[PDB]
Design a protein around this ligand. Structure first.
Ligand SMILES: *[C@@H]1O[C@H](CO)[C@@H](O)[C@H](O)[C@H]1NC(C)=O
Ligand SMILES: *[C@@H]1O[C@H](CO)[C@@H](O)[C@H](O)[C@H]1NC(C)=O
Ligand SMILES: *[C@@H]1O[C@H](CO)[C@@H](O)[C@H](O)[C@H]1NC(C)=O
Ligand SMILES: *[C@@H]1O[C@H](CO)[C@@H](O)[C@H](O)[C@H]1NC(C)=O
Ligand SMILES: *[C@@H]1O[C@H](CO)[C@@H](O)[C@H](O)[C@H]1NC(C)=O
Ligand SMILES: *[C@@H]1O[C@H](CO)[C@@H](O)[C@H](O)[C@H]1NC(C)=O
Ligand SMILES: *[C@@H]1O[C@H](CO)[C@@H](O)[C@H](O)[C@H]1NC(C)=O
Ligand SMILES: [Mg+2]
Ligand SMILES: [Mg+2]
Ligand SMILES: [Mg+2]
Ligand SMILES: [Mg+2]
Ligand SMILES: [Mg+2]
Ligand SMILES: [Mg+2]
Ligand SMILES: [Zn+2]
Ligand SMILES: [Zn+2]
Ligand SMILES: [Zn+2]
Ligand SMILES: [Zn+2]
Lengths: 430, 441, 445, 443
């Protein structure tokens, strides 16, 4: 029952890794221990320079072979225990007990909380790569859970850990369970408890603040690298890791009416959908303030009728307007002379049948406004047409968080425009 | 089929990779081809959907196994030919001709220029990790060289390529030869030319500007990641990638009197030495203008006597001054009352601790010159906090080259240094010792 | 499930196939843990792959290394370890795992697989007797279950068992390992799996082979001496000696307090020294008989003869009584009164300094000896003028010498007093024949 | 409960006072832990008290013992160990306790107390250089704080420090202990406490001392060779050598791949090998000057002369150039064209296998060598018809004196230029010592 201790989560400027390592060596002087890091920690860790204790440096180097940064190559045992900074081994044979639990149970990971101020708690977790989203909540079947929040020793087989795509990406507590929950693995939070370091790290408030800030930065870089734009929690809290008003949109220019996320087998990033909703809400309120007649058009009306929202692989919003009302709103008249950035940062342009409103100068998610005019009972443009009774009157229809205006009898309208059954038969990307 | 074509250097927004792939497949339908990218290239490359053409995405991903991001997974032949975008296969048999050249010569790498506007040139390259420097120059034994500049097809054994730490780090033209030259491997530039693509990529000024901006950013990040702080051409045309007046110094706060770079088995970053030279020259200029008697002290004097420069693993500069001259210098007078940022960004501080003065390069970069005031008492220079020495060593001072200018040193400075440090200190440098440092701490 | 560290110990630095060995295992598993152990850093360089799972363990002390750096168990983190000799190659995949599975399913603590060299391992029986400094090998009665192996094999066992031995990696490992496991009652199961031989085997030339065999023979002799094996025997009767001879010193050095050093080590007289004592006793008796000197077995030599016709197994010399008036008959004895004499066979004869007796030494260098005690009849009672402070040194009635009787001793027939039971009880006490004890029980019993 | 274990390692089986030593400590505290350590069972018998707190530790492999039996830490259950030499005696009660109090309150890893023998311990400075294979001793400038002790002292340190060393009990302990602790930068503090001497001191006769010293110097020589200490010096002098010489092979033997064995050891050239190289160079230069052969320092020899007046400390030969037209002046050189020549002082002169140069080896057995490269002017350029880059003749018109290896050699004029032509700009100022990591990568 040989288990390698692997230490990955610590701060070079303030850690208790020498105590952690010394505590395991007091129980077994030949205990295999691997401390992993991206660069050589400074100030020096000053680990014991004995063969069973090794520092694994994970970044590339001009003077090292490929194997030197592959952590599986430092681990020879069947099992591996991930130990966070702040833990120490006090009683003996605790790794042995965790191994027995793993072999007895049905969960590929077992875990023991560390008696810190934040000992690990069970969590439910779903990961939807298609929607770039990870959803956390309370774990119904605890102590069997999908993920942990807080400090714990996690033990699993080395062949399971190191066949993951990113086994030691930081923060481990986020990165590991995103990968294992996606594979359908469970973690059993055992009743065993590891003691805290007798001299804990981050004792001052300044040190904790510094560490929390570095940790938030690592978590944000991790989620961006792995395609998680949104972390949501049971109870409503949202964590965003995508585009915003001062960045570019996530996918950039489209070619052939197929954005890049479709070729990645994903749908629209949720931050982009959020920016579209708020631009739809903004434009609609501007149009209504100026007394401009508008209705939902094209795919936006289709999504409104289907689920009251933007079709989740769509990437813009379409509204129709009465051409004779264009003069009623200041931004449109401005848009005819040139680009107009208004007081809220939105960008209105004509560019030349329609108008386009972009979320911001940098973020080019947009709403298109298509002007129609009644020529003789049918609405028509000049660069397909439809009867004007569909606009007399217009009906309320929930869309993108607010109440939009839609053609009356819009299901009939939508089957006119797209064919029979379009609401019930979405054209899923493949 | 013994060679796998591997395409790493191209841009998603403007490339000729489809023509490249097609050109090799027209010569052999079964030719193994791997296009490597960090993420899925957009717009779609639309490569042929055949078993011998694979798109390798090297970034880690939540739904992929470890092997998916390891490039050797995608290659099953003895050799790899790195092919830059813009090249095209025209004459058949070029790859197998390059294999024959490799087997018969002594170079680990063989290369063929691509007939673009920037065809590959043979280069010398010396890589010193201790001094964080990559020194390029003209190749004395061309067409045997250490590195190439420009477009070439590069063939080598897959075993050799994928044993490197960063075999496909971009730019390949830079990271490959940094790694192979450090190992002492040669590349042989053959008398063979690959043709250029018939529709070349990046054919507009705007497209090339975009590509060059992105390539420069990738190179700067690569050199920092690998610890190359200085790149030179024939000892000149310096390109810096380290610290400067507006940043922190490279190694930050020193703990235990041993800076971080010694644990990394290296010497002082050359950007830090450059800043130390500039600060010493500036301080000496100020002290002489104000009429302040100074001399090189400690390891600065030792370095000056040894080779006229800072000892290349030291990280500061020490000068002695006459205490009664302190009042002559505005900055030193100001430093007694508090920290002073002068006209040119240098920070002058009075040590309340050890009773010396410290001049820092900038507010953010704490590379420093230390100033040690002494005062005579019965012919012996002494101070009140802590070795004292006879005053006659200062009567007179003598000129001594140091750090690119002429400094002042005690007369008989070899005797001076020997009394301070021991006999033979000038001839017997205390070279850094990683093994010992690993043992003592 | 099973993790096995490959550990290489048996190779020559001047000529070996370790690179091929290690590379063959890396071809089956790139992260395969491999430990090469050596006493000093091999030159020319081994040039192993400088990868974290391949390590060089140096078993030498060094000024800049902790104690752990030369203890090989700190390099092995796995449950199991496989000792692999140079000249072997990993060819079939998963052989180590099949070995782990056989060990777990069997009852032996060691399992082994031959290597397809010109000398593949073979099953042997082995008895070790430290008290008699002897190792006895024979044919395996219950093959493929053995006590020892002869020849090349991969040997797999638990790290905790290997590294709890006193000298786990002493060379030659093929000798050293099974001396330690057989003494503990452990068995090695010879499995029906075969590792392939190296494609470019080491020691390809006759000259390189010949230098390797002599270096190995020197290491084996050093190992056996270090561990106190003086004699190795094989079924068929063949003997290898590793102690005394006519041309060296005797094994133990000067004896204080009647108790030689080996008895405090809980061992008996080395077999090297006993053989020489028998050769010297046989020779001296022949000289005295040919010279017409009446002699009889004395002291511990007579007691050993009465018990089992041989030297007592913990004694270190031989004693004979002679008639003083016969001394002049023997050329060596006449010479010995004038000084030290080295005779026709290299035996050394001297008249001692202590107490009016003669001593015959096996050689000039080897001081195993026969002591000759001259007696003369006073009035029917044998006597001498100077006495040693032993309870065994007394007068005795001449009728015990009239006549002498034959009695086997040390491989030949010797002359003994008649009624030698009563003779022995008179000088040692009642029941001496039936109650063996060490030369002086107040110190060691 | 006691917190120090007395440990005895330095004694001779044939003549010791270890029974008196043990008894004296047990008299102060009958429970005092005592370990006597030896490589084999001491004979004649020590006959130590048969009590649980007195133990004999035999540090020898044995067929019937567990690995732990030969590991000294196995025998020590206390925080501290006191190494006590034979000839010492415990009289004043509570001396070990004062030593523990001294160690805890000071900043030295080791504390020591002299034993009042005829050779009481003295405080010494010691610098250990593994790269130069040298131990330099001297007077201790900051006594009572030392790097090392000479003479008889009880030494106390933590068990975890002592048994963490590679060779904690290697003999003689007085040498091996402080080589290990001084290398680590640990201090020993010589306390103002004295242990008494044994009432019946061991080794009381001249003959007994003679035997003890003979085996002790044998142990020291084997210890220093095993640990890679080739040279011991006192105050820079009184050299004591433990390497190669005129009668032996050179330390690193045959060089494969132009990389001598000492580089893989992460060390530089052994000092005995450098000493023989200086002697051979001085001799060869003396011969060539007497015979009228023009020569000059060449290659790395010139580089070492220009940099610090000596052989570069990780180089292992010496290179000189000569005028080919002058070779006939020297008898040894003339003989070398016919075959190998062992001259009157044992040096071996040979004309190269292939490569047209001459080689002078230190002796028939020791192959440290000086190479001579003959050049000849072909219109103002020096050239050898075999290939040491060709160079212009004016660098030798005239030659200049240059200190090298303890004597004055001839160098090309403007040797700074000369070296930069052959090695590249700034070569004198940019020495780069061996890089073992780079050696481990490239081979
Ligand atoms: C043992 O020595 C090594 C130095 O080689 C050091 O790293 C380690 O911490 C030491 N251990 C103890 C317990 O002193
Ligand atoms: C995860 O998926 C299940 C459906 O399989 C769902 O009911 C559950 O609520 C999801 N978990 C979270 C935390 O949203
Ligand atoms: C992945 O799993 C397989 C099968 O368990 C194993 O052979 C391989 O070593 C694993 N990869 C690792 C540990 O990197
Ligand atoms: C990989 O590179 C290392 C040098 O760091 C070398 O030791 C090893 O042999 C190389 N492996 C192969 C297969 O070339
Ligand atoms: C080993 O001892 C056993 C036990 O008496 C005996 O049966 C066997 O004959 C001996 N074998 C050898 C080879 O001496
Ligand atoms: C000796 O065996 C024990 C168990 O019996 C084990 O814990 C220990 O690691 C072993 N020691 C060595 C040095 O292998
Ligand atoms: C030891 O080294 C120091 C510093 O290098 C030096 O001052 C001292 O003289 C040296 N001592 C001896 C005995 O060599
Ligand atoms: Mg702390
Ligand atoms: Mg659109
Ligand atoms: Mg300083
Ligand atoms: Mg007898
Ligand atoms: Mg006797
Ligand atoms: Mg040479
Ligand atoms: Zn977005
Ligand atoms: Zn810098
Ligand atoms: Zn014997
Ligand atoms: Zn030498």
């Amino acid at each position: 029952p040989r288990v390698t201790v692997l230490v990955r989560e610590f701060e070079a400027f303030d850690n208790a890794v020498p105590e952690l390592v010394d505590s395991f060596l007091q129980q077994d002087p030949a205990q295999p221990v691997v401390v992993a890091a991206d660069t050589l920690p400074y100030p020096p860790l000053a680990l014991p320079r004995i063969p069973n204790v090794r520092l694994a440096l994970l970044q590339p180097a001009l003077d090292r072979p490929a194997a030197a940064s592959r952590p599986e190559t430092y681990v020879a045992t069947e099992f591996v225990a991930l130990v966070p900074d702040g833990a120490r081994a006090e009683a003996p044979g605790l790794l042995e007990r965790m191994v027995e639990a793993l072999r007895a149970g049905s969960a590929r990971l077992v875990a023991a909380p560390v008696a810190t101020a934040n000992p690990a708690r069970c969590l439910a977790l779903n990961v939807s790569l298609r929607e770039w989203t990870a959803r956390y909540g309370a774990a119904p079947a605890a102590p069997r859970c999908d993920a942990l929040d807080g400090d714990a020793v996690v033990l699993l087989r080395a062949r399971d850990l190191f066949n993951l795509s990113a086994p030691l990406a930081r923060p481990v507590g986020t990165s590991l369970f995103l990968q294992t929950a996606l594979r359908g693995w469970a973690v059993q939070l055992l009743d065993l408890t590891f003691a805290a370091a007798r001299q804990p790290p981050l004792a001052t408030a300044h040190a904790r603040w510094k560490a929390e800030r570095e940790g938030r930065a690592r978590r944000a870089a991790l989620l961006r690298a792995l395609g998680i734009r949104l972390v949501s929690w049971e109870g409503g809290r949202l964590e965003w890791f995508g585009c915003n008003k001062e960045t570019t949109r996530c996918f950039g220019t489209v070619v052939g009416d197929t954005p890049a996320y479709l070729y990645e087998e994903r749908w629209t990033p949720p931050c982009c959908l959020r920016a579209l909703r708020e631009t739809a809400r903004y434009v609609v309120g501007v149009l209504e303030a100026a007394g401009v007649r508008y209705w939902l058009e094209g795919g936006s009306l289709l999504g409104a009728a289907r689920h009251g929202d933007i079709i989740p692989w769509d990437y813009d919003v379409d509204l129709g307007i009465y051409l004779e009302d264009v003069g009623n709103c200041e931004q449109l008249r401005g848009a005819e002379a040139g680009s107009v950035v208004d007081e809220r940062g939105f960008v209105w342009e004509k560019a030349g049948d329609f108008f386009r409103v972009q979320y911001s100068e940098s973020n080019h998610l947009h709403v298109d406004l298509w002007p129609f005019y009644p020529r003789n009972g049918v609405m028509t443009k000049d660069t397909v047409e439809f009867p004007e009774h569909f606009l007399q009157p217009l009906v309320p229809l929930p869309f993108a968080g607010f109440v939009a205006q839609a053609p009356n009898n819009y299901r009939r309208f939508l089957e006119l425009k797209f064919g029979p059954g379009v609401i019930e038969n979405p054209q899923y990307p493949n």
